[PDB]
DNA sequence: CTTTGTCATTTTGCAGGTACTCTTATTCAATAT
RNA sequence: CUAAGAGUAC
DNA sequence: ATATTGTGCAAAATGACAAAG
């Protein structure tokens, strides 16, 4: 997580295997394979915290 | 063939492999070492010193009792006996290692030793020299000192002699190899260590700051010594430009520079001519010779033996002896520990004063820019301590130590006049305890990794770390792979991480050496003609060869040309130990001859110059892989023809960094030994236009290791690939023994249909590969079909899955022993009761029987009990509501994995070496591959499963053949694995046809043939395929590459890292989230994760995170002192801070703990970090 | 009692909690438990 | 550094990535499982009553 | 382990021709090749079925059996 | 099970062995049929009991497999035997004293639900051996036409 | 400064002692060298 | 006579981020109650 | 539980 | 019989020391 990019606001959509599965363009920013590779998940917990994750 | 001397072809050298591998096999350095410790180092090691002494002086006071005892204890013989195991009931029987591993003993066999206790007296009158005399008491009585582990299939092994049906009796695998030890039942390989070599002088520049130019070492030492390291250094003083250079030495145990004609003089060469006839061999250099003059300017003011000696005792950092001894002393310092590794007796002062003029002679050829400094990395100059020089000196100390005890308990018990008894006086547990310590704890003492657990997850896995090297980490670069790691070291095995280079993979064909005596070779030289170094006058011989045995000069030679043909001959005829390697630099006029330990070297063929054809040819000829042929198959009546009979008859030969120097190699016989249209599609080579070969490669794929050894067409492949490879193969999943039924590892997987490579290589017929494969042959299509196997995802077949494609058993095994708290507060294995218990566990108990065991064939799910254990505590305590007098245990049993499942396979239940049952339960699962799983092609190509196709919706061709596994174009042209793809190529064909494919390295197959068979066969030769889609049944309009292509199913799954936590357990200490999925734990919100967030410019979800997702404490303070020194009594709502003496001047704030706990310690420290709610300055 | 097998004779043994682990036939250390009798199901898939 | 530069969290995931072209690019695909344990607090409201009943 | 009762990628059934195919390749002296085309394996995924096949339960046959009746 | 595979193991190759299915429009998924578990409307009962009482390894086939559920007139159940020597496929071998007892039920499913019960092996699907409708462009070094080499079917179709 | 940071309080005279929250319990090694200076002290006391 | 700048030493603090698994070990021995 | 070490993933 | 005690930068800081007034 070299930049401010390499963190960024997503949308939930759930599914029913055991994977994070996200759009192919913007595995550039992440800078993310499907080789193996681990990515990390936090869920806000107030309203105030969840709109500025939303809008910024 | 006909004809029995005709020369061999390329495809003959296998042959001599095959015989190799027979004689030798894949661990036999490992074998080796062990087996020249326990013949021959331990009897060394408990005769050196050894011989307590105690010298009880008469101490009369009255001459009624003038006389003086000497009372010594000396060892004798050391037996070591087969391992056997004691008992509770003490009944002692054979232990075979499937016990060991199953009732977690040690691998062990007793050591005895001959202890004579002698005993002289002497009349003591004062000025008469005592005369000591025996009292006839030589009592003599082997006594028990501890125990030495055994490594398997060693001489000293049940397993040595063991055929193929008395090893599946013995429940163990003829597979196995050995080479490692059973330390409380769990297998511990050592790790070969590498180090720089001893007695080999080095010279290095220096940087410019420093005063001192240049510096030539020795780490001196002797191997039947001691065994200490003194460092010396001759450096040279003043930069170039300078004017005053002069030399000077530092000796051990003084603290100054002396300069080194003072010690030529004490050594007692007192004319300056000497000095420099004994540094400097040419007249006519005077170069040297005008370096040379300050030294002596220097040391002008001393022309005497003596007054050198006393000037170096002055000096002398001891300061303890008195003015006229000193020159004993420096005389002693210059016996005993200056250059300890040529001789610690007397009388050899000119021997030392050569070496030291060496040295310097070394040093100032280095400074006038003769020659460059030496290279740090050359691997001639390392040396791999293995199992036995690490046991060596390991049970060195330990013995020392034990004997150390013996010599105090003596004094002791003579000084108290109490009785002596050898059992009360040796101490096994010493060394029994010390070595078991060393071996289960890689710290190798009382460095570190350098025992390990043997892994076993794959049988190449264990291959290769039984040939595993380490390095320790100077301004040298070791990471990189130097050119003489050739053929001894694997090209591309290593690590990725912190230990790139310097964790490094033996080469098939190298062995280490494991040390000879050098006394025969020094006879053989003296007879030969090798002039003694004590009457060596250099200007009488100025054009002399200087010999060197073990970095020790020893001489000088006037005809080195003859004694180095009858040193080869000796050598290739058995005279002379094989490992022995012999040098001559012809340019520096010198003749090395290595005989110690460590020593990597390899095999290569001899060639000479055979007058009948006129040309070079190779010793070996067709007859000789005719004997070889007709042994091997044999051994599938005739005499015996082993890879020892090759050696003996001076076909092959062994060669090491140092001495494959001075030979040119042939790469291969049939191109390069005969004297001097070609196919467009094989590679480019060239014929070196040099006929003067001295040996040849038996094949050039024999430099690869153990895990590269698997990789098709290697040379086809971009050379990081291949790392990958080597890397990831030994993740990869397959059988790892055959006996893995009878074996309770703690992890096991397994593959339900290994199948072995449509591809393969020459050398993975010696690896077992084919016998123990660790993947399958998937028919793979390389296509952009859906977009789900982009960035490295792959697309695998369900309807394949189904079937049975990459399925896998996986045994876990949970160990749970009964320990005695007390006398008698012994643990009880049995199902615990909610009446009279604490602490049960949340899950359920209704699994366990009477016994406190789980019955093989019960499904068992995360959480629930398999193995029930309570332990006694005191009764009579009330609290927590439901705890009385009848709560007199605590449970102490062992739930299931929390994620994990399956069916308990099987349980064990025996007793462990202090007599305490203990069980084992291993459970066993299924793991079928699903989306995450990870793959990896034999060339680099790993990859995750994206998402799975039932057969319906996969791409089929026109005969319904559908892919296995679908991968990605875009992993091909950037990484550059052609291999790749001629490997899938060639699988086809092989598939088609019936044959193997030939996928070694080096051979001349190329893809224009493969395709020509390809297109015999009816297909397209460069195997494109027309395909249909899955969903409309419409022609593609791209074909697509498809064929089959060996696959590995790699140890990561998905399903062993997926981990959420909503909230659970907390840190005692610090009150925030544990570590770790295995406990529930929270993930770290790094400090640049906190950047990130700023950078964003979130700071209520930074807040958020740090304060409610983590740890939030609310605190008091008071207004007049900021600390958190507030008494606060919140049901009664009183606060007050003692001290200030205020009761409404109270805050409270919301801090994390964490920040609570280091106001506290600061506190602690004597620091008071005063917190304030208002401002006492403007901005 | 509950019911094991010798390691190596492979011969039954009925043992309580009070006995001593061992094979009466030949004296082996080792024991396994018997197999369950409670019939176990599995899913041929 | 080590516990209030950066610390660990509650509410926090941690899996394998995988590509998925079929979602949007601000999209995330959550495991049911995941999606499972995660949580957020929603204070009930007269708008959220029926549903959070419901999920109740 | 122990051959395989279907092919993995098109599903023939091969588990009936493992005794067959090393009595061909012993009794008769067939190579592979002439072996799985006489017993009906054309298309190459079967071939790599039954070809490439390591027969490991016979190890496993070699140890003693540790429930014996 | 006193054999050297895993219960798993051998369940698994048990689902993969052909069954006769001739009627099995006869017989009702066990979905959809009234009983608890199984009943012999929905699905056919074998039992396979095999014991090691040769000095040299038994092998284990689906010929042993024994109906013991009543298929009431139906021409389902029977494993499906192939080779000439009458032999099933190999489902599992015995050292001597080793045996192995069990007993399968057997329902109808599809493919989709998991390939053992797919019938169709692999199917040939072709059309337009000459690629008159170019739906393909075929790759190609000097000559495409020469490079490919013509399907059998080009003989059924004009030039 | 007058108030905070006298020189004087540069020298230790009375040690404060964190409470068993800072030191949590097998002791925590903070808790042995307070033992320590706890012995070292008593034993200057008692032999002055 | 004391600066004065100047080199040659001494300190001396640091050394990517997450994550997973397993193994061992918790002072040895002698003395006195 | 704690600590140390080793191996490993990106 | 068991508890108790005998590593390589590289900047900063510092010290030694020949020249200068
Ligand atoms: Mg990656
Ligand atoms: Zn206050
Ligand atoms: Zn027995
Ligand atoms: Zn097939
Ligand atoms: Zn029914």
Known sequence: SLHKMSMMAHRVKVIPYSTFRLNLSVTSPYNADFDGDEMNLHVPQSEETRAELSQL | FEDESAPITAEDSWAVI????????????????????????????????????????????????????????????????????????????????????????????????????????????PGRELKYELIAEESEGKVFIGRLPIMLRSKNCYLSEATESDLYKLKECPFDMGGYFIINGSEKVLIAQERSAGNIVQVFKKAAPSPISHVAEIRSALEKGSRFISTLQVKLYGREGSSARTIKATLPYIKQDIPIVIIFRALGIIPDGEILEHICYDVNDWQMLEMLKPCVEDGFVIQDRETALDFIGRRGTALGIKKEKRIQYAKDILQKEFLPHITQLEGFESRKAFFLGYMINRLLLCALDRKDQDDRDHFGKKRLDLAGPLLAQLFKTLFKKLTKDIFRYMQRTVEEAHDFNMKLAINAKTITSGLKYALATGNWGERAGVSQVLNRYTYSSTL?????TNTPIKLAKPRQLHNTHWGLVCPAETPEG????????????????VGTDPMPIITFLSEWGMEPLEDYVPHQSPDATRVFVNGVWHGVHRNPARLMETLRTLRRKGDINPEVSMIRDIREKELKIFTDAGRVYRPLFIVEDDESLGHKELKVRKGHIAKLMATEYQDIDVEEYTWSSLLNEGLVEYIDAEEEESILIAMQPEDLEPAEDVDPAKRIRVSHHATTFTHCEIHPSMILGVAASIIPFPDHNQSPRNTYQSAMGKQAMG?????????????????????????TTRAMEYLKFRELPAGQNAIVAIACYSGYNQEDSMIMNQSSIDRGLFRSLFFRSYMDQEKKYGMSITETFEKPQRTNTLRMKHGTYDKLDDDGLIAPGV??????????????????????????????????????????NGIVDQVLVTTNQDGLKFVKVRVRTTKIPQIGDKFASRHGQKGTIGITYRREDMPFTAEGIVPDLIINPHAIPSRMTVAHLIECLLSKVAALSGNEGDASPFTDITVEGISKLLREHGYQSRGFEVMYNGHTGKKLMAQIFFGPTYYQRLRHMVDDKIHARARGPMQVLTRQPVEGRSRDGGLRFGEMERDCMIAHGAASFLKERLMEASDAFRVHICGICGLMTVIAKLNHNQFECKGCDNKIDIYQIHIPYAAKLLFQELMAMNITPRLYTDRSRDF | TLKYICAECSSKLSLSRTDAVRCKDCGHRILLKARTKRLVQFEAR | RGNLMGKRVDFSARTVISGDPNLELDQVGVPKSIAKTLTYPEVVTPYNIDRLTQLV | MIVPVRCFSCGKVVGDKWESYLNLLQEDELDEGTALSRLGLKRYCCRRMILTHVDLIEKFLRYNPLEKR | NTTVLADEFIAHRLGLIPLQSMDIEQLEYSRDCFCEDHCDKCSVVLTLQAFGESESTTNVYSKDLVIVSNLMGRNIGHPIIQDKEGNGVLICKLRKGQELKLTCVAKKGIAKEHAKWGPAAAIEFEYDPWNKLKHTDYWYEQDSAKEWPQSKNCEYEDP | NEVFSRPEWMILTCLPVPPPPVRPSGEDDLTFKLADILKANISLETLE
């Open chain 2, 18 to 125: 095959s015989a190799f591998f027979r004689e030798k096999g894949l661990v036999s350095q490992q074998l080796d070492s062990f087996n020249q410790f326990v013949d021959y180092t331990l009897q060394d090691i408990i005769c050196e010193d050894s011989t307590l002494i105690l010298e009880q002086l008469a101490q009369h006071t009255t001459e009624s009792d003038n006389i003086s005892r000497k009372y010594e204890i000396s060892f004798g013989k050391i037996y070591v006996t087969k391992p056997m195991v004691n008992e509770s009931d003490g009944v002692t029987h054979a232990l075979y290692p499937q016990e060991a591993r199953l009732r977690n003993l040690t691998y062990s066999s007793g050591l005895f030793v001959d202890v004579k206790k002698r005993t002289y007296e002497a009349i003591d009158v």
């Open chain 2, 464 to 468: 290769s770390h039984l040939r595993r």
């Open chain 2, 498 to 513: 912190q230990a790139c280079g310097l964790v490094k993979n033996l080469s098939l064909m190298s062995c280490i050496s």
């Open chain 2, 735 to 759: 059988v790892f023994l055959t006996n893995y039924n009878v074996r309770m590892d703690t992890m096991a997987n397994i593959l339900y249909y290994p199948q072995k490579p449509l591809g």
């Open chain 2, 859 to 900: 499904r068992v799910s995360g959480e629930d009990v398999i193995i029930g254990k309570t332990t006694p505590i005191s009764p009579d305590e009330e609290e927590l509501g439901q705890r009385t007098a009848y709560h007199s245990k605590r449970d102490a049993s062992t739930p299931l994995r929390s994620t994990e």
